[PDB]
Amino acid sequence: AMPSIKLQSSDGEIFEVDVEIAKQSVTIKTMLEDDDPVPLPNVNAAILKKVIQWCTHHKDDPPTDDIPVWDQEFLKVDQGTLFELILAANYLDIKGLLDVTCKTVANMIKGKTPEEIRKTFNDFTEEEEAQVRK
């Protein structure tokens, strides 16, 4: 009494998810145009679940600091997995997740000095810092 499609992850773990939320990823619904798990390249089975939680929450959305409250708490995850969430929202073509995750990294870069930016995620000569200032 509910529609379901299989989605094979990069690891190989198949996910039986509803088509109404899989349709949130426009690459999956367009892949069905013109009874097998649809492939999700470069998307691990762990990130796939994190992708589902964001999509299954945004099932009622058709497409100034606009960061949502629940999403910014949903993105209280390690920096590594956040980058793995940006790439997926490009592979699955998720305009909401692609923007919320990119705006959050920019929020991590904004308001900080270049050293404070590098200290969060990490190669200059002594004049290279002065030459870049020019």
Place this chain on the structure above:
Amino acid sequence: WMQREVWMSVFRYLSRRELCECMRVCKTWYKWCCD
């Protein structure tokens, strides 16, 4: 690789002032903001 297109995308949301300081972070970033 993987760092070019993702970092260039977060640069669009940062205002023109933030991209000015973004060049002094790294050389790979310095080559990216000038494209």
Place this chain on the structure above:
Amino acid sequence: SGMQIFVKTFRDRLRNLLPQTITLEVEPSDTIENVKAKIQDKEGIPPDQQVLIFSRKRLEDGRTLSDYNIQKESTLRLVLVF
């Protein structure tokens, strides 16, 4: 000794590429890795950043088009991976 294949793409948003369909002149004995490099020549994306899927099965990089029964005028949606 040469066929024609189209490979439709998907909307990529990190790379501002609209969904298009690249046309290829290949042979059924060409491996998936070869036809991935035949996409490299016209655009410049390495085969390690490409994914071919004919119907619902990811195309392995070590098999020819004859293994997946890829005939002429067949469309293979390609997906980029970082």
